[PDB]
Symmetry: D2
Subunit: 380 residues, 4 copies
């Protein structure tokens, strides 16, 4: 199947029993047994397995070309289950600018269980190699990252991990399985905040994990059954439903990204623009070799906090909110929202100025989105 | 408010905006901000807070006479969040017969993070005192326990915990807040598998935690936001809805329990009957001092595995399934289902014979339930 | 099965395929066919049939001791489908005080299709006989009625209908199948606003119809498939779920009704009290012969509009709202809400004074409900 | 707004109260009133109005450039409400090949209420004029029609209706508001089976109606409130959600239609192909003047029943089922499914041969869909 066909027919999303062309919502906690231990269709207790959740798990496995899928109550729960593959005394390497929620969990929760963490500039793979310790067991990378869209070489990271005996993990949220497939590049585990593009409609919080490794899958299943951060059946259904349109949504988003970037690069009120499609973006070549499309997150700098605040008030179609990947276009200012707890001098050295604006391109008309942002910039 | 009124009007379960008499289902992931950092009603991102989940959290806090409530994707997720209050090097004491899911998580997951566990016969409080170590930080008890309904003195456990500097935790699933309120007896944290009685309809998997301690609540909120085992909005709504009838359901269940036990005690095919209402049950007096009603779980022994298997096939109204607390009556054989991985000789020393049958009394007609089980026993 | 057992095990509310102990929610519109015309489980298109809707239809048929059940998008849709059994030129007799929504549909919609209607005092069965015309085809009665709880003799009405060649219909909303079963008394069709007691939680709008007559059922099915006022699958699920607790809810409501009426009859600020349990209520004897319990709707008179308005502001547990049958107690003033379009002089001749208050007793604690209403009355 | 922007931001689909970027699901039946008759936000009883249903009503009004929208429990319920604008003695003109469900309701239900119907070949507007009677009050047309995609001139029909004093109605299901807007061409009422393209995911049954005429809207609202075929809140939410991707879905469908038709026209096993894009299709010019895109329904003839049956078994990506407009491609044989009750000789004179196959193009990859159908045809 080509990609758009796989989004409709990959995995198991119909009812074998009635023929229903959509996955029934099994709002149930337990299953009758005909004889003790005799499970009619392999279900016994919804925390261990639920048919609607099993459907979305089969879909993400299919879309990432993995064997096993797992659905969690949030992206953070997916990350937590993966980190729980490790033991006290183990060390993990992550990219320097990792999601604030990943950063928080690792430095404030899992350090109390003896997991040690280092945040490394993974855009230079030599810095990965230099950071590996005897106790390192995992390499965890996002690419592209937030909010500056830094790109990390997935295939090289997978090779480094294999050579040094590490479990490799990619957070593939920003690219989605439609454009980037880490498992095909040798990564062990791929994961997503399905809250973003996969659900696509700003109406489900969910995490998804996929792997082809049977032993890691058994370990993940045991962690899931033992710590219980499972996705419910209604959210599993809405996620399956949202994924159906993923290809069309990302293709529209990508058309708009191209034109929006052109407008931003020409606008006199905009300084730097950050997106992996830009020729001068660091590791642009790496991104084009490992992905066949782009994320809809773009960041760009205006002069100062006052210009960013006024830019947002002047748009018609950009919704001021957290999150990304929705059908509606979204806008934020990282220094005031996500990164406000970081001292301003450190933020700036990290490349996040007070005037940095982040947008998540939605599926509105491309000309409307370009013209709306351009006229708002014109007021600065 | 008396208890039945509190189930309807405790907490916040209406919509201030429209006046809707039920909690709207906020199937949403993010919230528009008018100005940066200006939250219209305090919501910014559904993982951190969602109005439907906030509703069920307010209800469980009210019903347990606590200040703060937390809703998780499963009972196991609630337990995991509570255990994560501890650090590597800390020790926890739990009752000897704790739920297999609690047992699994603690011995196979959290031991890998340096949490050490001892399982103690908490029906004698001197055994609790004798087990406390310098590194003990938590005392976790279920009462009554599964499947033999062992009773632990909550008030004495709370006093021991306070004197020895331990966080006390009670799993109150089997009694519900309608009959037993550990926080009022000095316990620090109370938790539930809301999958069971609270939801009540076999159609939600969920965990709930309540506490009056502001600092423990801040620690729990941070763990929840960082590990993300949150309950979704549809499941939160169904849980709120199910809780409305909790008092009526438990009162019907309790009427049937009395008559069923009378019939079991007189039946020649039944040996021991286990339930805290029975006069000869160990710590019967303790149970009646700390609870004003009973659980609907009853266990009783028939001769052997063959008699239990045939008892189940002979009933009309008892559904062979895992779980408990449903409107439908349920039946199981622990030695073949929940405890089958435990060597048979150890099972028996633990008091679980091959002929032990567990029932969860539902809300069917009392005479029907008594007569159905009695005639099935008559076939043995 | 006794009544409480029938509410749990009557009809088909489990999944044969997985063993799920609750009805799956088939949020689907169409069904795969293996061969043309070969329906895997008899489903082809959800408007014609949907498994979740089929579940609630089987339940209402079971509870009313009928053969065929039908689920509609509202009580009004159920009534409309039943009236559509008739042709232009046909006449229908209804009780004099029929629900305003029934009254509206018949006099303003169906009269335009040539259906003629007369509203008769059916509390005297001779007035029914005197109203029958050559073209009369249907006798439609509510008992008890709203808001004065007038009682009509069901068995005599069924006999009159049979002798005169009429289809008999009872709106059984206020009594529910738990206490009154018109089909067992010879009535042809029974119907409900399932929005009220059956759903029970103020969170579903729905209608239900049951009959034992195969030919009327075929006519109803054809009307349903042709005019399409079908109940959706999520609402069908919530209705099935709510019905599980109907017996317990009505028994608690009935205990409170007895005590509330005692308090109202003794209170010096209350004049007449209207409820079929009252010895002096017209056709009290008829009600006790055809029902084995009571409705939770009670009406009572205070002095004037000012006393009713102030009574409502003074209660703690009575919610000012339309509808009835909820777990929360509700209060209204018919002259200001439901009947405000009727000239005040006609309202009074109909027995509805400006001071008439209607309450719907919920499942709060009986003492709380009695004391709350009594102290509010004390302020008058 | 351009069309793709209107699908995201037209109507009201956010929560003013919390800022939630999606419409909350108001699973509720009634609303608290602060003072008698004082509605906090204009809601009193969900049958009369529900905020989630009000959201989808605002969306369809926006997308059709109307003032008022109405949401019904099915397309058939929408049609029934519109027909109920008429009285006994009135006559309606409809296209000769109108949907079997419309045909059934009109000829078997509404004729019993004195509504008279004539089915006219509306592809020649002179046949419309010749059919108008003194009692004609309504002209109802589908364009394109099923299964032969016959095209009727909307603007001319609107002019004829205006001149002759008729209410004009277009069933716009097959084109959707994305490509054809009857209200802008002078039609009085537009309606949809939202079960098809608008929901788009084969998981909601729903009807929608829009109009700009205030008096017709008041009449429709009264009919809706009186006959109660209302869409529930969960289905209203899923419909709003599905509509977000309508533009992207229809654009992908249209790209595939072009290539599929090219392949069908060249295939030696295919005789006639029916679709309005084809140059030789009757009223092709009319269609291109009144629509700016195409439907995804295509019909084409193979030799006989045996070739159609074997064509279907030989495809990989075409699901044998009723309905259309889904993300998955669908296939059917009208003579065996929808039209099997029509004598075969009449079917053929109506242009429906035993070998006529209907497909509904979904959003799978265009090359996959073309190649799959072409190789299946190659087996004939």
């Amino acid at each position: 199947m080509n990609k758009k066909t796989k989004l409709i027919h990959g995995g198991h999303t119909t009812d074998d029993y009635t023929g229903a062309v959509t996955t029934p919502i099994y709002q149930t906690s337990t299953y009758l047994q005909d004889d003790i231990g005799d499970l009619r269709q392999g279900y016994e207790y919804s925390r261990t397995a639920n048919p609607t959740r099993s459907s979305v798990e089969s879909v993400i496995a299919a879309l990432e070309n993995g064997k096993h899928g797992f659905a969690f109550s949030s992206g953070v729960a997916a990350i937590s289950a993966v980190v729980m593959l490790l033991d006290k005394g183990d060390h993990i390497i992550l990219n320097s600018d990792v999601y604030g929620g990943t950063y928080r969990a690792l430095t404030k929760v899992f350090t109390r269980f003896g997991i040690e963490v280092d945040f490394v500039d993974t855009t230079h793979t030599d810095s990965i190699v230099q950071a590996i310790r005897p106790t390192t067991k995992m390499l965890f990378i996002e690419t592209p990252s937030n909010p500056l869209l830094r790109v990390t070489d997935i295939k090289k990271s997978a090779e480094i991990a294999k050579e040094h005996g590490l479990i490799s993990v990619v957070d593939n949220t920003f690219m989605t399985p439609y454009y980037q497939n880490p498992l095909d590049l040798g990564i062990d585990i791929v994961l997503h905040s399905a809250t973003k593009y996969l659900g696509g409609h700003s109406d489900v919080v969910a995490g998804l994990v996929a792997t082809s490794d049977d032993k890691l899958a058994e370990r993940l299943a045991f962690i899931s059954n033992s710590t219980g951060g499972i996705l419910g059946p209604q959210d599993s259904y809405l996620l399956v439903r949202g994924i159906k349109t993923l290809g069309l949504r990302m293709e529209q988003i990508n058309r708009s990204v191209i034109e929006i970037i052109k407008m931003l690069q020409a606008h006199p009120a905009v300084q730097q623009v950050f997106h992996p499609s830009i020729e001068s973006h660091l590791n642009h070549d790496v991104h084009m070799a490992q992905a066949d499309g782009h994320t809809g997150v773009i960041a760009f700098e205006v002069k100062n906090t006052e210009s960013a605040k006024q830019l947002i008030k002047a748009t018609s179609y950009y919704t001021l909110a957290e999150s990304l990947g929705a059908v509606e276009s979204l806008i934020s200012v990282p220094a005031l929202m996500t990164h406000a707890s970081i001292p301003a001098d450190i933020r700036a050295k990290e490349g996040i100025t007070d005037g940095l604006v982040r947008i998540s391109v939605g599926i509105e008309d491309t000309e409307d989105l370009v013209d709306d942002l351009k006229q708002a910039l014109d007021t600065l």
